Enzyme design. Structure first.
Site, PDB file in Angstrom:
ATOM      1  N   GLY A  36       0.780  -1.221   0.000  1.00 21.50           N
ATOM      2  CA  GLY A  36       0.000   0.000   0.000  1.00 21.50           C
ATOM      3  C   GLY A  36       0.814   1.274   0.000  1.00 21.50           C
ATOM      4  CG  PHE A  37       4.825   3.545   1.681  1.00 20.93           C
ATOM      5  CD1 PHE A  37       4.361   4.779   2.130  1.00 20.93           C
ATOM      6  CD2 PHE A  37       6.112   3.461   1.161  1.00 20.93           C
ATOM      7  CE1 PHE A  37       5.165   5.916   2.054  1.00 20.93           C
ATOM      8  CE2 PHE A  37       6.924   4.593   1.081  1.00 20.93           C
ATOM      9  CZ  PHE A  37       6.447   5.820   1.528  1.00 20.93           C
TER      10      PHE A  37
ATOM     11  CG  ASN B 266      -6.986   2.653   2.713  1.00 14.96           C
ATOM     12  OD1 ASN B 266      -7.218   2.196   1.590  1.00 14.96           O
ATOM     13  ND2 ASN B 266      -6.637   1.884   3.740  1.00 14.96           N
TER      14      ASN B 266
ATOM     15  CG  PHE C 298      -7.180  -2.988  -5.577  1.00 19.42           C
ATOM     16  CD1 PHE C 298      -7.956  -4.121  -5.805  1.00 19.42           C
ATOM     17  CD2 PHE C 298      -6.269  -3.003  -4.526  1.00 19.42           C
ATOM     18  CE1 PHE C 298      -7.828  -5.254  -5.001  1.00 19.42           C
ATOM     19  CE2 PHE C 298      -6.131  -4.129  -3.714  1.00 19.42           C
ATOM     20  CZ  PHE C 298      -6.911  -5.256  -3.952  1.00 19.42           C
TER      21      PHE C 298
ATOM     22  CB  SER D 283      -8.918  -4.999  -0.748  1.00 16.33           C
ATOM     23  OG  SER D 283      -9.330  -3.648  -0.888  1.00 16.33           O
TER      24      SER D 283
ATOM     25  CG  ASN E 280     -11.330   0.170   0.495  1.00 12.28           C
ATOM     26  OD1 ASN E 280     -12.278   0.534   1.191  1.00 12.28           O
ATOM     27  ND2 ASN E 280     -10.067   0.250   0.904  1.00 12.28           N
ATOM     28  CB  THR E 281     -12.102  -4.677  -4.339  1.00  9.29           C
ATOM     29  OG1 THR E 281     -11.058  -3.751  -4.668  1.00  9.29           O
ATOM     30  CG2 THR E 281     -12.501  -5.442  -5.599  1.00  9.29           C
TER      31      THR E 281
ATOM     32  CE  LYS F 124      -2.397  -7.136   3.957  1.00  5.13           C
ATOM     33  NZ  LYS F 124      -1.569  -5.987   3.498  1.00  5.13           N
TER      34      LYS F 124
ATOM     35  CG  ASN G  50      -6.079  -5.647   3.771  1.00  4.92           C
ATOM     36  OD1 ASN G  50      -6.059  -4.426   3.908  1.00  4.92           O
ATOM     37  ND2 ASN G  50      -5.896  -6.247   2.598  1.00  4.92           N
ATOM     38  CB  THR G  51      -7.559  -1.879   6.639  1.00  6.15           C
ATOM     39  OG1 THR G  51      -8.162  -2.152   5.368  1.00  6.15           O
ATOM     40  CG2 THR G  51      -6.206  -1.217   6.414  1.00  6.15           C
TER      41      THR G  51
ATOM     42  CE1 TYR H 124       0.039   2.278   3.154  1.00  8.02           C
ATOM     43  CE2 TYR H 124       1.366   3.989   4.200  1.00  8.02           C
ATOM     44  CZ  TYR H 124       0.514   3.580   3.186  1.00  8.02           C
ATOM     45  OH  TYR H 124       0.100   4.473   2.220  1.00  8.02           O
TER      46      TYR H 124
END
Ligand SMILES: Cc1cc2nc3c(=O)[nH]c(=O)nc-3n(C[C@H](O)[C@H](O)[C@H](O)COP(=O)(O)O)c2cc1C
Ligand SMILES: CC(=O)Nc1ccc(-c2ccc(-c3ccccc3)cc2)cc1C(=O)O
Ligand SMILES: CCCCCCCCCC[N+](C)(C)[O-]
Ligand SMILES: O=C(O)c1cc(=O)[nH]c(=O)[nH]1
EC number: 1.3.5.2
Length: 365
Positions: free
Chosen positions: A66-67, A114, A118, A184, A186-187, A224, A253-254, A325
């Site tokens: 992610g960074f 966040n 992606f 993730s 966000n997907t 992950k 993950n988050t 991160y």
């Protein structure tokens, strides 16, 4: 000045007061890629060395995915002190991600939320970017500084498994380890790939593609996972992992959860929460997966690590390596050396000969 206190109390606070998080991030990647960093100083001792996933790691502290999403600052990250670098989460085709703003700071919670979605330069661009330094990386890896490549899927993909298969074929030959990111938040529908039936099919295809690569270009494969899995989900993942011979797990993950106590004004923004509020949820997930896999499956622990204690707690819970991160986003480059120094001191203080001796220690007490 290259000082922990100066960065945490003045430089970083000032920077965050002038730039929004995404802008600060882009600026950070730029400076890092150019090697414009404060002194490393800290010398990795033999105590921090770890042998896992078929590689030697100078130290167990890596930069989480992610960074450096597009593999633009790998060398600068090793210079920063990370024992290993994991790049991006690359999707087959390029895609812009969600509209801005898409990342938010929760300073009062030392956390971030966040929803980038992606954003990626795509496999082809990253492939050539890594090829340009492939031999330099080969020497780095031999020197104990491995490279991981995190694979994602395109938003409009109609075949999720094929997206990962493509990533394995294109970037697998350039990585020490690959990460199948199915966590993730966000997907749409991505996390559903963590289900037993879907996961088994997905990973069987991924492993077949990886096994089809030349030996020198055959990376380890890790999955992950999210920190929001049910007990049933975790049992199933552990089962599939052992059934297929998956090489390892990157744990947490988050989180899409919003723990009671968050003070940040932006706590209700949609997205994955990272940082301190995620720390113990991730540590407990590591603890559970370690037990479910009988300590036979290497785990990279990540989530809220900002100190030596945070790192050691995850190691004692079962992690062979850890990543961070969010801590970097608040404390800056000096945080890497801080974590390593504090970890070394704690290991000695607790009677451990080295990191390897502490892995999973809590399960044996
Ligand atoms: C802005 C941001 C972007 C991220 N992008 C990715 C990504 O592309 N792929 C991935 O696997 N994890 C991604 N992550 C998750 C981190 O790799 C890590 O699992 C999580 O943030 C917990 O670690 P931390 O508390 O030290 O930040 C991202 C996290 C943040 C804060
Ligand atoms: C969401 C996100 O990635 N945020 C961030 C990501 C990175 C950074 C950062 C990291 C390293 C430096 C740095 C580099 C070289 C020399 C000196 C300092 C500067 C800024 C800050 C944020 C942030 O929210 O403020
Ligand atoms: C990334 C913006 C933060 C600004 C600070 C840049 C620090 C420069 C560090 C100086 N130096 C390369 C000589 O070590
Ligand atoms: O790109 C993203 O939004 C993203 C991906 C991921 O795996 N984790 C996260 O927190 N954000």
């Amino acid at each position: 000045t290259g000082d922990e206190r100066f960065y945490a109390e003045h430089l970083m606070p000032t920077l965050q007061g002038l730039l929004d998080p995404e802008s600060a991030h882009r600026l950070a990647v730029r400076f890092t890629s150019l090697g414009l960093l404060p002194r490393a100083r800290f010398q990795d001792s033999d105590m921090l060395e770890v042998r896992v996933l078929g590689h030697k790691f100078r130290n167990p502290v890596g930069i989480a995915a992610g960074f450096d999403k597009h593999g633009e600052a790998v060398d600068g990250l090793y210079k920063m002190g990370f024992g290993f670098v994991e790049i991006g989460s690359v999707t087959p085709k390029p895609q812009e991600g969600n509209p801005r703003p898409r990342v938010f700071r929760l300073p009062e919670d030392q956390a971030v939320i966040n929803r980038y979605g992606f954003n990626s330069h795509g496999l082809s661009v990253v492939e050539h970017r890594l090829r340009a330094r492939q031999q330099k990386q080969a020497k780095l890896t031999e020197d104990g500084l491995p490279l991981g490549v995190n694979l994602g899927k395109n938003k409009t993909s109609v075949d999720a498994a094929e997206d990962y298969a493509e990533g394995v074929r294109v970037l697998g030959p350039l990585a020490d380890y690959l990460v199948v990111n199915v966590s993730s938040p966000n997907t749409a529908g991505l996390r559903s790939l963590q289900g037993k039936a879907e996961l088994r099919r997905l990973l069987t295809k991924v492993l077949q593609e990886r096994d089809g690569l030349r030996r020198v270009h055959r990376p380890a494969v890790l999955v992950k996972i999210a920190p929001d899995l049910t007990s049933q989900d975790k049992e199933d993942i552990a089962s599939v992992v052992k059934e297929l011979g998956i090489d390892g797990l990157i744990v947490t993950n988050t989180t899409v959860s919003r723990p009671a106590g968050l003070q940040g004004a932006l706590r209700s923004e949609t997205g994955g929460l990272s940082g301190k509020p995620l720390r113990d949820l991730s540590t407990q997930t590591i603890r559970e997966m370690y037990a479910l896999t009988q300590g036979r499956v290497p785990i990279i622990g990540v989530g809220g690590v900002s100190s030596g204690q945070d790192a050691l707690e995850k190691i004692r819970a079962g992690a062979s390596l850890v990543q961070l991160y969010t801590a970097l986003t608040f404390w800056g480059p000096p945080v890497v050396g801080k974590v390593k120094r504090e970890l070394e001191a704690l290991l000695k203080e607790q009677g451990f000969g080295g990191v390897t001796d502490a892995i999973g220690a809590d399960h044996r007490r």
